Write a protein that binds this ligand. Sequence first.
Ligand SMILES: [Cl-]
Ligand SMILES: [Cl-]
Ligand SMILES: [Cl-]
Ligand SMILES: [Cl-]
Ligand SMILES: [Cl-]
Ligand SMILES: [Mg+2]
Ligand SMILES: [Mg+2]
Ligand SMILES: [Mg+2]
Lengths: 159, 275
Amino acid sequence: SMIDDDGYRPNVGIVICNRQGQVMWARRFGQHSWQFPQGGINPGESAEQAMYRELFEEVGLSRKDVRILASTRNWLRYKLPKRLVRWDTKPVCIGQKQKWFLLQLVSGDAEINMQTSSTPEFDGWRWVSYWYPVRQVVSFKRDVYRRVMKEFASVVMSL
Amino acid sequence: SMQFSKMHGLGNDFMVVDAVTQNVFFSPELIRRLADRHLGVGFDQLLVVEPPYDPELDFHYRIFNADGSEVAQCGNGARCFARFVRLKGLTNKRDIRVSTANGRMVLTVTDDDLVRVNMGEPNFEPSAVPFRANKAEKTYIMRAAEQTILCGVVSMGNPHCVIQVDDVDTAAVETLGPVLESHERFPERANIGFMQVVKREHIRLRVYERGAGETQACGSGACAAVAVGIQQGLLAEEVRVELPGGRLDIAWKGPGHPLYMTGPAVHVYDGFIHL
Ligand SMILES: [Cl-]
Ligand SMILES: [Cl-]
Ligand SMILES: [Cl-]
Ligand SMILES: [Cl-]
Ligand SMILES: [Cl-]
Ligand SMILES: [Mg+2]
Ligand SMILES: [Mg+2]
Ligand SMILES: [Mg+2]
């Protein structure tokens, strides 16, 4: 129902940094591929609200475990590759519209808990250097990642 | 429009490209075009900064020549690279961990904006040079044509023979250079350094490189000259090296320590080119 008229689901993505300027990299459940946390915005909620909701759901971090350092000024879209589009589910989703948030983890690493939900999207995590995700992200997200990390870079450097 | 910079380091003109925040694929065709001084940009070498392949490193970078081939020479472009990623706000680190075609380095950007490279520990074992001599001596005797020469011999990873000279502008680098470069006691040849000791902390140097002849800024040769001079009791712990192509600063505490080479990188220009 939240799919817009172009087929894009509104969505929030999360870049969690530590004080050393590393960023949190999460492993997709039962897979060997990795990504930043992201999640669909629900009917009712703002971007910020969706962000906190998916943050606890996917990473186990509460509002007091983090502080918002920045968000992207605009929405950044990515299109699914055609072979991943589920054409029989109406309304058809062809990609995500995304509002990205830069968070600083202010609590200890032990606060990250990837099992607060019964259906976790991730099964592990590590800190990686700031630009490593631009290479390692799945191809169809790389355009968005490159633009997000470029936009966030000046904030993270300044710590 | 792809943004780039021109930079100058170790006597070389680099075109430098942020391929971290820019999406650019450097095919041999595109490289050859960019190397064209009229259709493209023009450069001695092209330095491309990329996201790291390893999550514990900050960047990867590659160097390409005008033919469009990747070049793998140890330490090549390191000063321009370190200064570029700081000038462009890709990092704020002073110790930058980077992978290259030749492996990884930790580069340090000093307070006067110079870039310091750990060159490893110099090795004086003749077998490791390779050099034909029975044991490591601080000074060796060699006959070059109708001449006898005193020299030091060290490996910085590559082979070096250093000769003290009382004025580098006068020395016969064009005659003695070739004779010692392919001298019988260097089975794999050697870089021949002509060192003028101005002060325990200041030398002038010219280098007849293995196979390449006299170049303007051989970094490993500056390291080797200072390493031999220190081993021979002639030089201080920190030496300014004046080469035809500019100045380096070598630091070495002697055996058991690595040798450090510090050098500048000049930001010459910025530009853009529509691909
Ligand atoms: Cl909470
Ligand atoms: Cl990449
Ligand atoms: Cl350089
Ligand atoms: Cl001899
Ligand atoms: Cl060599
Ligand atoms: Mg998700
Ligand atoms: Mg989720
Ligand atoms: Mg969700």
